Ligand binder design. Sequence first.
Ligand SMILES: C[C@@H](c1ccccc1)n1cc(-c2cc(F)cc(F)c2)c(=O)[nH]c1=O
Length: 244
Amino acid sequence: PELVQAVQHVVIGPSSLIVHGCVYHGTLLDIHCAVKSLNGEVSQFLTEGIIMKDFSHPNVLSLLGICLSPLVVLPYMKHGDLRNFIRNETHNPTVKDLIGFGLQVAKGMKYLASKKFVHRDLAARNCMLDEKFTVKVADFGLARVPVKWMALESLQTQKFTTKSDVWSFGVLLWELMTRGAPPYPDVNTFDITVYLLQGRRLLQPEYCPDPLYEVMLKCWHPKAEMRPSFSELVSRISAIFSTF
Ligand SMILES: C[C@@H](c1ccccc1)n1cc(-c2cc(F)cc(F)c2)c(=O)[nH]c1=O
């Protein structure tokens, strides 16, 4: 009804999209795009469109538009996801370049948080890279419609907030400083809640600066309230990057 009218500015007409679930290459008119096919719930998908169409930040993947299986049209990202990029042979980003990637994630997340957007699945596998190696926060498989990245309160209560996203970002920083290493590889899926309650945490990566590892430890506080906001994380990571 009114949702139907509110999504008109995000709806793309079939005479403007050429598709060539999963992601397929496609062309858009208003240009090269990525089109994900989505194999009650349609109502929640439409409100997401209204929200994500408002997005305009250099570190956030933009939503070009939506199709009526429903399709999602996103800008094409040449170097794919961040996690696979830091594990690829052809790319050798320095430790300063990895810190820089993390800062771009923090600024895009600062933007998402300024707009009251709780990501729910922040991980390096969900951040894309474009042709200029700009890191763009994205979701490659529905989250608002991954236990080794979830906050303690999310594991126990199933509640997701911006402070629980800060916890996921701490794990994302670890992934970057380890170059795509699986967090908690010897901790069962069914054992992390007790492991985290007992105080235990991920250890300092070999090539991680001491102030940057303190930042990861701040994101992993048992109290969500005691965790640094995204604005604070941008401030602290910019400070580290400038003096590294
Ligand atoms: C815009 C981008 C994103 C996601 C999170 C944070 C920032 C940016 N994005 C949006 C959707 C999406 C779009 C919709 F219109 C409805 C929906 F259900 C999902 C998606 O599947 N993947 C993805 O990367």
